[PDB]
């Protein structure tokens, strides 16, 4: 019923599993990203202007009460903010943006923080038998990353296993997937070298360990660790956070803010849990229809999360897209996939692409475990 | 921008900690409640008519990928449904209803399942040191119920401790709180005896243990376990689930459904984390304003979750409410408080009160850990 | 140089998660030891006890030096030389043998021997905790299984090897069940007639929150016999064509036992009446899987060591009944009169607290010699790993 | 009846989470034992070994009967009588004493004694796992602390009691540091000159994923000495006015040691050359907190038992240096020539694998007598709980 504008975005670097962000919690990473975003829009006062935060997170175990609430308060936002945490597995942070946009369109909020955070490193092990007792015989300690993040709830198989099934189903070879993975790494490394992520990234302070000096994590860790022979001769596990600030048109005028983009529309779809990898081919058309884009060729750039090579290959094929418009800075296969964050990360990167590569209309898409996908259409100002 | 109707509601009985629902997971309880609700509206086809599920859950550890998704699929809903899980601590299930209503008002869905589920019994223990190793010296196994459910994230104190602080702050004595608790138990027991919960409750099948016969859990477990002397001479830990079905006016006409109530409005507010108990006094006025209710005396019944006695006492006082209109079937202090469920449970019970006690306008409210509260106004048909 | 048993005592044997679940292995050890000390006041706790050697298998979470703790908790002088020994099921018998050897060499004049075990309060282990699990599921190991009940070489339970033994010596389910029933019935009769009353010292259980203290005074397992359910019980170790079940095998149990040994010198100086003389002992081992009939090798060695050249001169036999097959095989191999063997019942009916049973059988044997008019007695116990220990005693 | 040491061997001592982290306690035991067996081929593994008594403190997750596993993994006959003994730090010395007693009584003619320990691979325990935690946080206990390093009565670390000892006998931080430095420097010199080469048998470490196998050939701790950092190291057990630190205390370590004992009879029949004679031994104990100077009580008893009436007739002393204070106090109390004590260094510099150290000091002592031209030697080791063990050997 009314226009929703992105006025600021930021994200942390993406850390490797047990890597450079191991000492940070998911909430701490969330606060860093959000503080990075708030700094760019000082016209919005932290103590009064922010009505709501909706934040993505998948592995909430041991984060404490209300992760989104903690993120807001740690970032210096007023405790009057309405906070909620949302989980749509991989799509969590995208769903947060969509829910934020809906909230603005309904007139129930004027300024919304959306985004997400995840520390897959610091997701704990669970002991299901601890409370009632094991009684006799061995019992299992469950890895929370696997159980709640990476494995399908219905067959127990890892997302990478389902990505392989999808490749077989669409007659995409192992070699094709490897080629694409390698190509994606090289695009990610090149985009890094050329400073393409510099505007979106805010660094993370790492406390020096008992006399060691403090330092900063400034860049995505995963791209430099490509090993071609190993790849040819599955789960990307990562840590990170991303944040975006959404405002109504009204607020944009009263506070004299520069809009970065307008949320034209969004679409969500789902089908068989095992077929999640090509669920974006269902969500994208719904989003384009919602945005009033009749022709798919009017879109300038596409960013899929593309955590697996098959996701990039299949969805481009099904949608009949020009591959030169798709994931021009690389994808999650190379950059990493912090589950609760990635959904907003693709939107952050998409917006950077539109600004830096001279695009006007962009669509972001992300598939999620459970069989779903989410998609958003934005137009640069 | 358009009317949202409740067409069906249901809930499980509320189990005691390590009690009658110990053998059920949060997802299984969710499916029971949702199947209970679907059965009442056969005009809506499970295979085609449901666009979205938004489901509350706080303790997601060891539930598997995407609890809301699992609930939908276990209840027999089509895998085309758009699923997301939301956490607003105690208010989770209320927030789900609000997000569902917003989704309908925006024209992005026509039929939404909202509600929530929780098994505090089967929330696991965590081992934070398991992944990287403990190295040397003792390490702690964390109770997930405490860490993510009951304890405040900022000071680490249980919700009951903050309820006591609130009582001191508003000069409400220990004896007053005990009186109210006891009174609430007796109202809950009486409402149970008179069959007041019979229409909303659907039973839970319990599998008989190796030759023992299967049975059904049909009633709320907590009310019968009142011990007055013990009370006079803190955390209510419970298991359960609740579901509500929301539709647009359009759908209500095309499918020839009987509306039970209309969602007139809602309001959310927050302040200091330690003061969560009287956050409903901020949320209720916002909800009434959103619903266009100028006078608070036009409301016929109030249902607060009222997990602690102080919540009932303080908020009634601050809002200057007629105590005979407030929590006439009792409250969570007596019935129990399954965190991710209670937010929808109060709406379910409120609607039952309006139908059975001859009310037209009702407001439900629920405070949550982190300092927030959510509120909804409904009008019976 | 003669070694005399001067006093014995044991706790009641508690069931798994049963009547002694609130007590640690050390606490049970102290009860048994104090029970034994009380019967010989001539020996002063603060001066006369040179050494303690105490059996225990599951030492995890007991704290530093279980035997030492048992001695000090029982009020013995901190000058006592303390050591803990583990020979699995035969631990406590090995403790007596090592105590005898110590007296024999003149190193000690008064030795406390025995054993204790709380299989209930044995903890779970996390092998991956120290270095980290990194990724993927990891296991919490049950200490009872890993260090007590499972073979170290193939990882199979003692019951699986009891089944192998049943097959190799063609002992049927029927035979085992009848032996089990017999063991229960004898155990119940002995309890009824007070045959364990001299042996047993009660365990005080603390009443929590203001309820009065309660007393555990008898063995918990014998009362559970249900003959019909026993005969139709499922085969637990082998699904198809099995013979061993939960009811014809020894259960998991808690308890302790203690015996006081003295030299001939001390016997005369303190004017103590000796209950028995340690005539000899024998230990043997072979294949781990064949532990069930290792006592048939150990017994002959003990008799030879004692100077008994005809096996029929011994009046009573106490074989630890870890399984019904153990009682049946060793009686058959040694070609013994079954009426001389385990006359008060055995571990199938009374329970099997691993670290304790080795001394428990000696404690009971001595009572049998005193009460049933026997002079010569042999105790024998098999142990996981393929071994067995045996001791010959003569009543004075 | 004479008891002769006929062969000795030990593994290198690995650091905590260090060079032997991939090996279990049993595996290290087998290496040491096989090292010892190799030096006496006249003794056949399949027939001549009657008994094994092996020291081990942290038995959790080792599997049934650690000593038995060590024997069988080393290729000994499954007819061997096996038992595991625990006397905390003195376990392995107690194993030798019990082996000697066994030979002396004629029960055995050839005994394997020694000990093994992997403090690295000792697991964490979960006491609440079996019955359930119910509600609220629960603790995962470090087995190293609970059963190895902490006193059972007050729960304080051995280092806290070492501080008490420093205060009670007025031994300064400076004195301890200088003793520590001295121990490191001697240890390094001995390593340089190959003084441990006869003793030590190397441990093969499996190379994972196609990398070649590697070899651990020397003790890991001695190379870590940094004198300046040692002198300014923080006091770990006592914050204010502390004396004991990480660098002047023994570390946490992995390793194993083995000695082969025979009767005079076997010595002549198999035509073995004896390395030493067990002249005697002595054990004593007192207050748990005073364990550090318990060796000063044990040593006199051993000398009396051996028939040595003047302490100056002994050529070399091996005291286990659990802490720098232990070396200093016991030398002062016994009024010994410090140049006769721990001439190759000690546990502060070499490491202290609890279940192994008791035999390790005997192994090293014997090497000292052979290489430094000594005849009479005494080894002594204190243990948690307030005890100490001591043994007197004479080179042949």
UniProtKB/Swiss-Prot annotation, chains C, D:
Optimum pH is 8.8. Belongs to the thiolase-like superfamily. Thiolase family. Acetyl-CoA acetyltransferase; part of the first module of ergosterol biosynthesis pathway that includes the early steps of the pathway, conserved across all eukaryotes, and which results in the formation of mevalonate from acetyl-coenzyme A (acetyl-CoA). ERG10 catalyzes the formation of acetoacetyl-CoA from acetyl-CoA. The first module starts with the action of the cytosolic acetyl-CoA acetyltransferase ERG10 that catalyzes the formation of acetoacetyl-CoA. The hydroxymethylglutaryl-CoA synthase ERG13 then condenses acetyl-CoA with acetoacetyl-CoA to form HMG-CoA. One of its GO terms (molecular function) is acetyl-CoA C-acetyltransferase activity. One of its GO terms (cellular component) is vacuole. This is Acetyl-CoA acetyltransferase. It is found in: Cytoplasm, Cytosol. Its main location: cytoplasm. It is an enzyme of class 2 (transferase). It catalyses: 2 acetyl-CoA = acetoacetyl-CoA + CoA. InterPro entries: Thiolase, Thiolase-like, Thiolase_acyl_enz_int_AS, Thiolase_AS, Thiolase_C, Thiolase_CS, Thiolase_N. PANTHER family: ACETYL-COA ACETYLTRANSFERASE, ACETYL-COA C-ACYLTRANSFERASE. The active site is at residues 89, 352, 382. Its EC number is 2.3.1.9.
């Amino acid at each position: 019923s009314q226009n929703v504008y992105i006025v600021s975005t930021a994200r942390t670097p993406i850390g490797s599993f047990q890597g450079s962000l191991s000492s940070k919690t998911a909430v701490e990473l969330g606060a860093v990203a959000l503080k990075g975003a708030l700094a760019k829009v000082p016209e919005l006062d932290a103590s009064k202007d922010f009505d709501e935060i909706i934040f993505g997170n998948v592995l909430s175990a041991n984060l404490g009460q209300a992760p989104a609430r903690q993120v807001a308060l740690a970032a210096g936002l007023s405790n009057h903010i309405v906070a909620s945490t949302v989980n749509k597995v991989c799509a969590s942070a995208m769903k947060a943006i969509i829910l934020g946009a809906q909230s603005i369109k309904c007139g129930n909020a004027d300024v919304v923080v959306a985004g997400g955070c995840e520390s897959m490193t610091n997701a704990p092990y669970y002991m299901p038998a601890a409370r009632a007792g094991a009684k006799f015989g061995q019992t299992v300690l469950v890895d929370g990353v696997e159980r709640d993040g990476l494995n399908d709830a219905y067959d127990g198989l890892a997302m990478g296993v389902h990505a392989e099934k999808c490749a077989r189903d669409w007659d995409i070879t192992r070699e094709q997937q490897d080629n694409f993975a390698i190509e994606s790494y090289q695009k990610s490394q090149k985009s890094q070298k050329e400073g393409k992520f510099d505007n979106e990234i805010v660094p993370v302070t790492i406390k020096g360990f008992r006399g060691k000096p403090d330092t900063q994590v400034t860049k995505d860790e995963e791209p430099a660790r490509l090993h071609v022979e190993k790849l040819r001769s599955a789960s990307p596990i990562n840590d990170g956070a991303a944040a975006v600030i959404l405002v109504s048109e009204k607020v944009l005028k009263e506070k004299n803010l520069k809009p970065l983009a307008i949320i034209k529309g969004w679409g969500e779809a789902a089908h068989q849990p095992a077929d999640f990898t090509w669920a974006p081919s269902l969500a994208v058309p719904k989003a384009l229809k919602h945005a009033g884009i009749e022709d798919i060729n009017s879109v300038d750039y596409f960013e899929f999360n593309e955590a697996f090579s098959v996701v990039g290959l299949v969805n481009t094929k099904i949608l009949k897209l020009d591959p030169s418009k798709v994931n021009v800075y690389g994808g999650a296969v190379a950059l990493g996939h912090p589950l609760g964050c990635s959904g907003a990360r693709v939107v952050v990167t998409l917006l950077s692409i539109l600004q830096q590569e001279g695009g006007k209309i962009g669509v972001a898409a992300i598939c999620n475990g459970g069989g779903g996908a989410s998609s958003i259409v934005i137009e640069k100002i």
